[PDB]
């Protein structure tokens, strides 16, 4: 229904991540924590770092418990190593509960903490299967549900500004909402449409059809989910499998053919700029991803605008952007640029993910993002990769 205490509790942006305030220890130590549906560990800076202005001080927490075990988590993004322990954790603009949770106290890291992000840790919201060192390390959300009456569901409204936010603006601006235990009806318009969670590890889904301005990409649907498709608040871009990326970029280029962009733009490396207020949104196509429905042989589609896939960046008074669709060798990743178009419901209890048009999606007077259905779709199980 209505969760006023949790609405507008996020800050950040697609390039740096969206974070929520949390407290760890007794007395409480306030930290800003990245909301990450693409991982399953609660890991916080616990030692001085040039890019951290605060960190978790275990020696100052009377409720700190040492698990006497280390963990090393290498990624292609940042690498981190930490010391496992437990402590009391709260979310000030969240449910009015305090839970005992696992915390990986980061003592060393490489390219993990980013200069100017304003976050000191990561809240991994995915399932125990992908927790490090192994699935015996109960994720935060699992602890929260076990220890309290909080329903086994959370929902995210990530709010892209539609323009660059400087260092001060990004600290003062509302970046969205994380509703823990419910669905807030003020955060979306129209209906919520649900897609099954294929398997409980990452938030895995199945894409059944892809269109660029209504034109079918016409690839075998298995290609769209090769080797998986996930919903990840911890990824900036919409990431597509190599072959899907090559077909999508060819189609987006054909649709926007009245303006030639350098190769660097399509590679997501170079920005493109237009005179203030003249961005030619109309020349770029809409993108629709059809997802498996809850009813047999039924699908629905989510449609994003270039206002979602063109990420605003500062150059001048020009309006500049980077292309926020990129290739992947690890499957489709529906990152922040996709999530900014929708209110996304992580219905863990009913093993499903809901999508509705976000009340904060950026658009123009001519087009809006959309969530529509149903469509009759056959052999959708065949779209899943094994
Ligand atoms: C939006 C946003 C963001 C954003 C900004 N800066 C750092 C990060 C992240 C750094 C690291 Cl490491 C992250 C991990 C744990 C591993 C990974 O590789 N992906 C992809 C994740 N889901 N989770 S997210 C995210």
Q: Measured between alpha carbons, how far is 95 from 6 in angstroms, rounded to an integer?
A: 8
Instruction: Give, rounded to a whole angstrom, the gap between the first and last alpha carbons of the chain.
Output: 38
User: Which of 18, 8, 22, 60 shows the shortest CA–CA distance to 38?
Assistant: 18
- Tell whether ligand 1 has an atom less than 6 A from the beta carbon of residue 130: no
Cα three-residue angle 40-41-43, rounded to 5 degrees = 150
How far, rounded to the nearest angstrom, does the alpha carbon of residue 183 sit from its chain's CA centroid? 17
- In order of 21, 42, 103, 338, 360, the CA distances from 123 in angstroms are 11, 5, 10, 20, 23
Which domains, ranges and CATH numbers included, belong to the chain?
A: 18-150 (2.40.70.10), 151-386 (2.40.70.10)
Assigned token pair, 71: 């963990």
- Tell whether ligand 1 has an atom less than 6 A from the beta carbon of residue 114: yes
Assigned token pair, 176: 């969205």
- Tell whether ligand 1 has an atom less than 6 A from the beta carbon of residue 46: no
User: Which of 38, 189, 51, 196 shows the shortest CA–CA distance to 118?
Assistant: 51
How far, rounded to the nearest angstrom, does the alpha carbon of residue 152 sit from its chain's CA centroid? 19
How far, rounded to the nearest angstrom, does the alpha carbon of residue 165 sit from its chain's CA centroid? 19
User: Which of 262, 263, 225, 268 shows the shortest CA–CA distance to 244?
Assistant: 225
Nearest CA to ligand 1 atom 6: 16
PDB resolution in Å: 1.7
Closest ligand 1 atom to 79 CA:
12
38 CA to middle of ligand 1, Å? Answer: 8
């Amino acid at each position: 229904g209505s969760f006023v205490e949790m609405v507008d509790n996020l800050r950040g942006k697609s390039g740096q991540g969206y974070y929520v305030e949390m407290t760890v220890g007794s007395p409480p130590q306030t930290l800003n924590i990245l909301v990450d549906t693409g991982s399953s560990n609660f890991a916080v800076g616990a030692a001085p770092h040039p890019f951290l202005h605060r960190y978790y001080q275990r020696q100052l927490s009377s409720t700190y418990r040492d698990l006497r075990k280390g963990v090393y988590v290498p990624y292609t993004q940042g690498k981190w190593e930490g010391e496992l322990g437990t402590d009391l954790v709260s979310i000030p603009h969240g449910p009015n509960v305090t839970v005992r949770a696992n915390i990986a106290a980061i003592t060393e890291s490489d390219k993990f903490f980013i200069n100017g992000s304003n976050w000191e840790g990561i809240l991994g919201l995915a399932y125990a299967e992908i927790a490090r060192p192994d699935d015996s390390l109960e994720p935060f959300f699992d602890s929260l549900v076990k220890q309290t009456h909080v329903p086994n569901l959370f929902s995210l409204q990530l709010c892209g500004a539609g323009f660059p936010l400087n260092q001060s603006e990004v600290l003062a601006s509302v970046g969205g909402s994380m509703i823990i235990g419910g669905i807030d009806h003020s955060l979306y318009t129209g209906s919520l449409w649900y897609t099954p969670i294929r398997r409980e590890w990452y938030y895995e889904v199945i894409i059944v059809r892809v269109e660029i301005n209504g034109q079918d990409l016409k690839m075998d649907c298995k290609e769209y989910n090769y080797d998986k498709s996930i919903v990840d608040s911890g990824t900036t871009n919409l990431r597509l499998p190599k072959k899907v990326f090559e077909a999508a970029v060819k189609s987006i280029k054909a649709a926007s053919s009245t303006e030639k962009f350098p190769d660097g733009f399509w590679l997501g490396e170079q920005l493109v700029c237009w005179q203030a207020g003249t961005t030619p949104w109309n020349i770029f196509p809409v993108i629709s991803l059809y997802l498996m429905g809850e009813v047999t042989n039924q699908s629905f589609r989510i449609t994003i605008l270039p206002q979602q896939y063109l990420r605003p960046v500062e150059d001048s008074q020009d309006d500049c952007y980077k292309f926020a669709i990129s290739q992947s060798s690890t499957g489709t990743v529906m990152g922040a640029v996709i999530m900014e178009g929708f209110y996304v419901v992580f219905d863990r209890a009913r093993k499903r993910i809901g999508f509705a048009v976000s009340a904060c999606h950026v658009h123009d007077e001519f087009r809006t993002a959309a969530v529509e259905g149903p469509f009759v779709t056959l052999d959708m199980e065949d779209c899943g990769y094994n």
